[PDB]
Design an enzyme around this catalytic site. Sequence first.
Site, PDB file in Angstrom:
ATOM      1  CG  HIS A 746      -1.925  -1.053   1.228  1.00 39.87           C
ATOM      2  ND1 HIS A 746      -3.240  -0.821   0.903  1.00 39.87           N
ATOM      3  CD2 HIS A 746      -1.834  -2.365   1.527  1.00 39.87           C
ATOM      4  CE1 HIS A 746      -3.917  -1.948   1.002  1.00 39.87           C
ATOM      5  NE2 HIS A 746      -3.086  -2.901   1.379  1.00 39.87           N
ATOM      6  CE  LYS A 755      -7.537  -6.647   5.733  1.00 40.34           C
ATOM      7  NZ  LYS A 755      -6.873  -7.897   5.282  1.00 40.34           N
ATOM      8  CE  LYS A 772       0.284 -10.498   0.574  1.00 40.41           C
ATOM      9  NZ  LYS A 772      -0.329 -11.099   1.782  1.00 40.41           N
ATOM     10  CG  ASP A 819     -22.412 -27.593  24.448  1.00 39.84           C
ATOM     11  OD1 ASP A 819     -21.440 -28.348  24.239  1.00 39.84           O
ATOM     12  OD2 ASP A 819     -23.571 -27.852  24.058  1.00 39.84           O
ATOM     13  CD  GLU A 912     -20.094 -32.079  23.192  1.00 42.09           C
ATOM     14  OE1 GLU A 912     -20.191 -30.860  22.937  1.00 42.09           O
ATOM     15  OE2 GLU A 912     -20.564 -32.967  22.454  1.00 42.09           O
ATOM     16  CG  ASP A1158     -26.762 -21.851  20.647  1.00 44.00           C
ATOM     17  OD1 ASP A1158     -26.999 -22.968  20.147  1.00 44.00           O
ATOM     18  OD2 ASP A1158     -26.780 -20.789  19.991  1.00 44.00           O
TER      19      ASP A1158
END
Length: 1205
Positions: A746, A755, A772, A819, A912, A1158
Site C-alpha cells: 500500500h 475490514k 505486505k 458448549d 463436553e 445454545d
Amino acid sequence: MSKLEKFTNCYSLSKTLRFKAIPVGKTQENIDNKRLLVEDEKRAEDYKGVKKLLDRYYLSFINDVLHSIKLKNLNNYISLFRKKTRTEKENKELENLEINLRKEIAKAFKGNEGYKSLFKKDIIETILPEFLDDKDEIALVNSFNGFTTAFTGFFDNRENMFSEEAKSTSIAFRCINENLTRYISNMDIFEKVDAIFDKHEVQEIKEKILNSDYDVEDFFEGEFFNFVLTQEGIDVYNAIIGGFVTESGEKIKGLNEYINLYNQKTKQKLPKFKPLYKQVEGYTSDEEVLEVFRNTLNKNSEIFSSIKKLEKLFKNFDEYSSAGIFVKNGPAISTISKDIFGEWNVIRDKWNAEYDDIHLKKKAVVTEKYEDDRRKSFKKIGSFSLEQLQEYADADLSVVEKLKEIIIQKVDEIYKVYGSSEKLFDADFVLEKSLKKNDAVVAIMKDLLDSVKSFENYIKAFFGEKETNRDESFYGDFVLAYDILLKVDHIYDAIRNYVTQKPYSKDKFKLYFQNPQFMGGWDKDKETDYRATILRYGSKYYLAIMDKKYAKCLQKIDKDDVNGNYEKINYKLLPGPNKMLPKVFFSKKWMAYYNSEDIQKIYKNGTFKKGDMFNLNDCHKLIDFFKDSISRYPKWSNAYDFNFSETEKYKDIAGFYREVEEQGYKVSFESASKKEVDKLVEEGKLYMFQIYNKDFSDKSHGTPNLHTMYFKLLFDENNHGQIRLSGGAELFMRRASLKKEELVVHPANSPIANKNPDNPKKTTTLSYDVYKDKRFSEDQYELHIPIAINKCPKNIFKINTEVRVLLKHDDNPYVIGIDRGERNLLYIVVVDGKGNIVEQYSLNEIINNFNGIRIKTDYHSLLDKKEKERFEARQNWTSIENIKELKAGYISQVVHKICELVEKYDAVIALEDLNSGFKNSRVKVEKQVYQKFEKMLIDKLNYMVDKKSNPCATGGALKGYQITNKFESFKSMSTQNGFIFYIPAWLTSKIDPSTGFVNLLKTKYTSIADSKKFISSFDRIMYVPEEDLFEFALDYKNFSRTDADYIKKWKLYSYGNRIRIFFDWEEVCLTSAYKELFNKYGINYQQDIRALLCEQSDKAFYSSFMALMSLMLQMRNSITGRTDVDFLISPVKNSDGIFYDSRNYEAQENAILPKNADANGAYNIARKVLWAIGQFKKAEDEKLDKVKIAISNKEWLEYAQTSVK
RNA sequence: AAUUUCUACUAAGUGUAGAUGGAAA
Ligand SMILES: [Mg+2]
Ligand SMILES: [Mg+2]
C-alpha cells in the site's frame, strides 16, 4: 483465601521463546567478508546426503547380520497356529512365546555385532569413513567431522527399528508379524495345492537358474523362515512367488502366475499367493508435480489398472462365499446399512432387536445398564458376514447384487471423471500458468483424486479386520488391488501439501559459527568453549559472538565511567545437582582433601538411598558431608551465597537436592566499555546482534507479548527462581523467500480500507509504506532461547484430588460451562453453587480491550463470509485451509476470555467429552477444531498468567497458577483435569430448564396398529376450552425405552406454536393444527377422546397425526436460515403453570433461565458439573479420590428434576 | 495490511489485541 490462590508453583514446565536477532554495527559486513554463512548453508543442504548414507549403512548392517540369524521357537509356534487354538488358555503361551521371540531376535541388533560404535560420533568418525567408496561420499562425511551431534534426533529416530516397540517401525515387528502370517499361510496353501504345478514345466525352470540347490522344494518348508530375513533371499522368494526375469528376455513365469493361468478349467477357484513385507509427489517444482500426477494416475498407471482389476473382481462378486466374506464393523456400517436397506440405521436396529430377543427377557421396559451393555456388546462384535446381512434383510433383498450395483455405480462415476479429465492426461498437454494460481489444473486434479479416494475409502471396509476361513480366492485378488490403491492417499496428501503451500517459505538452516559447541551454555567459566554471551544497554538486550580464535576478547573490558557501559550477564544456574553433586564430590579427589569411615561405609551400603525404613542419621550423614564440602569447595561458595536452612526441617534426600538446586541460581552482571565492544565489532573480532521483536522497538507503547514479558523477567530483581534460562540456545537463519520483484505494498498516503465493520473509522492514511510480508522478503537471523518455568516447585501434590477437596470444604462453588451451538461458535454460562445463571453470553464477538477503549471484532460473521467464499472458489483446497486456520485462530482468542472468567470467579470449567457425542452436522465448530481447543486450553490453563498484572503478585508472570496437569493425549481426556471436568453431552439441549422435562417418546409413524397403541398409551386427550389448549396426560411407565425419566408422569399441552422442517420453512400454530386435524377428519373434540380417535383406520390420519405430535415435542425450533429467530419452548407447565418460551427472556438484562437454546446447552452442562460437586459433598476426604463423575442419564434427570421442585 | 510466529486487524501512526514449545521425524 480463594481456591485458586493455593494453586501455584506446582510442577516443572518448559517453554521456548523465539527472537529475531538484528545484526548491528559492521558485523554484517564482517560475517560477509569472512564468509561465515555459506559453509553452514552447504552443511545443511548436503546433510540429506549424510542421511542417505546413514540409512544405507544401517541397511547393510541389518542385511549382513540377518544373514547371520537363526530362529528356534517358530517350528512349534507355526504348528500351534494352524491348530485352531481358539484361546482356552493355550494361546496365552502363544503370546508369551511370540513376544519373547520378537525380543530375542532383536537381541542381535540391540545386543551384539557392535551396535555401540553406531550411534556415537564413532559412526561418522570411523565406520562410515571406513565403509565408503566414492570421493564425494567421503567429501560429505569428512566435512561433517566435528559437528557429530547434528544427528541427535536422527539417531534417536533410528532406535525405533532395533527394538520391539510393538509397532511397524521396528525390525522384528515388521519382519516377524508381517512375515510369519504370510509365510505360514503360503506354505499352507502350498501343502494344499502343490500338486497342480507339475515338475517338468515350472519346477525345473525355477530349479536351475535361481539357486542350484534346495531348488524350490525346501523353500516353503518349515524353518526356511530364517533365510527370508535377508534381502536377496527374500527378494528371490518374492520373485518366485510372482515371476522371474532370468537376466534376459525369457521372463520365466512364477508360481502364482501358474495358478492364475490354471483357471482354464474355470473351476480351480484356487486363491493366489502372497509375498512377504520388509522395512526400509513433487512438492519441489510445478512441472514435477504435474508429471507425477500424469504418470501415476493415467490410463496406463498401476492405480488405474488396480481400479479396473478390482472392478472386474466385483463383476464376479455373487459367486463367492456369501457367508465367508466380512465387512468390518464400525462407522462404515452406518452408511452401508443406509445404502443397502434404505434407512440410515437399519442393520443397527436389526442387531439391537436380535440381542434384545436373546439376552433380554420379556420384561416391560429396558434399563440403562442393559442398554449400555448392549451397545458395548455391539462394539465388541468383530464384523458382519454378508450372510448375516442376508438374513438381517427382508425377503427378496439381494445384498450382494445391491452391493455390486452401488459399487459399479461408483466406478462408472470414476470413469466419467476420467472422461472429464482427458485433457489433462494427454501427454501432449502443457501448462499455462503457475499451478498454484491456476485452477483448471487443480480443480480437475481434485475432482479426480476425490472420487478415487472416496472409492478407496468405501471399499476399504471389506476386510473384517484376522478371522477364520474366508474366500481366499476373493481376498487374494482383493488385497492385491488394495495394497496398490492405497498409494492414492499419499499422492493426494502430497499434491494438497503443494497447492496449499504458502508463497513465502520458512526454510531455515542452523548456524554454528565454526564451533561444535556453539551457544551450548551460558557459563562464565566455559564461555570460551561456548563463545556466546548477552549484553544490555538500558532496555535493549544484545547478543555477542566473538570468533573462533579471539575467544577471550570479552574478558578484559571494564566500565571506565565513559558515560556509557554495556552490562553483561553471567553467573550460571546450577546444573544437575542430584547427579553432578556426587561426581563433583566423589571424583577420587579425596587424595588430599580430608583425613572419615562411616560416610564411606554408608555409601558402600547405599543405605542413604532408599531401601531403609527411616533413619535420623544415615541419610543426614550424606547430607551433612555434602553441606560441609560445599562450604570448603571454593569454586561454588565463592559465587553462590550458600544459605541453607536448619537441620530439623530435613526429612529426605530429594528435598535436599531440591534445596541445592534452589541455591544454585545466582545470575548477576559485570560491566563493560561501550567503545571497547564497539571497536571489537569494527575490528571484526566480535559479531554482535541485537535481540529484537516488535516490542523492544521504541515506538511500541501498548501491552507487550507474553513472551516479551518472560524474557524481560529473566533478568529482573524479582525473578528469584521462577523463570530461569535453560541453557542451550541456538541461532537460525532463513533466506528471503520472496523475490523483490514480487513485493506488494500500500503506497504512502493512499487511503486504505478497513475490514472490520464494527470499527467506526472506515479508512486509514499512514504517512509511510506497508510492505505486505516484508519480514519474509529479507534475510532474518532468528534465535531460540529455552526457559524452564518453575524448575524447583514447592507444592508437590496431585491436582485432581485437591480440587475435589477444596470443592467439598467450600460452600459456594462456581462453575463455568462451555458448549458449542448452531448460531454461536461458543456460548458461555457460569452458574452459582445453587443453580442461578450468574452470567450468560455468546462468544461470536470477541471484544478486544485495548487502551481503555474497547473495539469488538466479530468472529461468526467473519466465518460466514469465509464460508460463502469457499462456496464459489471452484477448488477449495486453499479455501479450506484458511478456515481451518481461522478457527484455530479463534480458539486462541477465546482462551483469554476463559482464563479471564476463571480468575474472576475462581471456578471450574465444564467441557463436553467428545468421545461420546453426536453433533448435528450444522454446529459451526466442527469436532476436529474443538478437540484442538481442549488441547489449547489445557496448555494455557497449565500456566495461566495475566499480562496486565503485577509480575510479582499471584496470577502474574512469576506466580501464575498451574491448575491442570500436563496434556497427555487426545483420547486420555476423561472425567476430570485440574479445574476442567470432561462431562458427557447427552440430552443436554433438548431439555427444559424450568422443569427438567424431556421427550422420550418415539413419535414417527410405523403402523396404524402401532399408531393406535401409542395413542391409547396416553392418559387423557381433552381440548380444554378454558385456556383453549389441548392438554395431554402421559405416564412414561406406559411407553417403553423410558428408563431415564424420574417423574415419569407429565401433563402436556399445545401451548403456543412450533416451527417445521419440511428445504422449505413454514411456521404453524399447534392449537389450530389440532383444530384442523380434528375437523378435517371429523372427530368430536370438546371431550378424553382416545377411544374416539382409534375408531379411524386410515393411514391418511394417524401418520399425519404422529408427525404433528412430533411437532408438539420440539423444544428446538429454528429457521435454519436466520440467526434472529431461535427460540426454545417447553409444552410442560412449571410450578406456576406458565410455560417456558425463551422469547420472554431475550429482552432482559440477566434472566434466570437460558435465553438461547445454545445457552441452554452450557446451562445443562454446568448443572451436570454441579451434580458432580454434590456427589463430592457426600463422600469422605480419603474417598474423594474414587468418586465417579460419569453422570448417567437416570441420575442426571433425577438431579435436573428434583433440584428445581 | 507491518509480527519470533499465528490469528483478527489499523488499534491514533514503522504499529494494536490475544496466543505461542522449539529442534528433530
Ligand atoms: Mg502488544
Ligand atoms: Mg493476517
